[PDB]
Each structure stands twice: as C-alpha cells, then as structure tokens.
Amino acid sequence: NFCDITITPATNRDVNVDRSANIDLSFTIRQPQRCADAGMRIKAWGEANHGQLLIKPQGGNKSAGFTLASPRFSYIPNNPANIMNGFVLTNPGVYQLGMQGSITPAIPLRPGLYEVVLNAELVTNDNKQNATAVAKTATSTITVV
C-alpha cells in the first residue's frame, strides 16, 4: 500500500538531438515509504563509473559512455547515509534518490542511440548485504544524431 517506486519521465528523449549544449535530464528512484519508515534502507543505482547513472550508446560499453556532466542527488531530507554497498542509500525514514545529469557540450554528438538505465531495490527488510530483494529496471533510449 504505502510503497512507491519509480524512475521518472525525464527518461528517454524526443525525436533526435544534434545539439552540443546543456540537456539536463533528471532521473529519479523512489522507494517504499512504509518500509523506509520500518527501519529499512533504500537502494538505487545506475551505470556511471560509480554505478550511479550514465548515458552510454545502445549496444556500447559504459566505459565508452558519456558522463552526465555534474550529476546531482536529491532525496527526502531526514536520515541520509554514505554511498556504499555498491550503490547509494540513505538511512531509514528516507526513500528517495534523484539522480539528475546533463548531456553537455563536453561531448561532441555523433554516436548512435544512447541507453540510460536506473534500478531500484529495497534492502534491510529482505537482507542487508548488497543485492537481495526486488530489483526494478527502467531503460531509456536517447536519440543523439
């Protein structure tokens, strides 16, 4: 009932973009309100060098992908935590990870379609090691021309 999980609409682009300019794309991972309040931590991760969020060519490697300029992380202010266990997590009482990146002029556009994936999971209730419960997935193709 009181659990919300979502990787938000800033996923995917329109038809095509040939601009080398700031195209800010704000992605989000939401976790169960009641489970967070139950003493459980939120899990969210992406594809960056630190597994946070990354835009990389479809069929390509994340190490060849393009960095999100300056990724920012927003959340529900209350009980935070350190980025460990292979992902970003807060303390119980919080269920939010807003990962907003920007495909910037820092990369000259020309490669084919990009893929952006965000993953979600609830830990601590199930197990608190690294990966154990329901991992959600959302991948979006960004058309760069």
Q: How far apart are CA 99 and CA 142, in angstroms?
A: 16
Taken in order 119, 130, 97, 2, is the CA torsion positive or negative? positive
User: Which method was it determined by?
Assistant: NMR
What is the per-residue DSSP string for 83-141? S-TTSB---TT--EEEEEEEE-TTS---S--EEEEEEEEE-SSS-SSSS-S--EEEEEE
Q: How far apart are CA 115 and CA 104, in angstroms?
A: 16
- What's the total number of domains in the chain? 1
Give residue 26's domain range. 1-145
8 A C-beta contact, residue 43 and residue 104: no
Which residues make beta-bridge pairs with 114? 57, 142
In this structure, which amino acid lies at residue 3?
Answer: C
Residues 6+ apart with CB under 8 A from 9: none
Q: How far apart are CA 12 and CA 17, in angstroms?
A: 12
Q: What is the CATH number of the domain that holds 86?
A: 2.60.40.2910
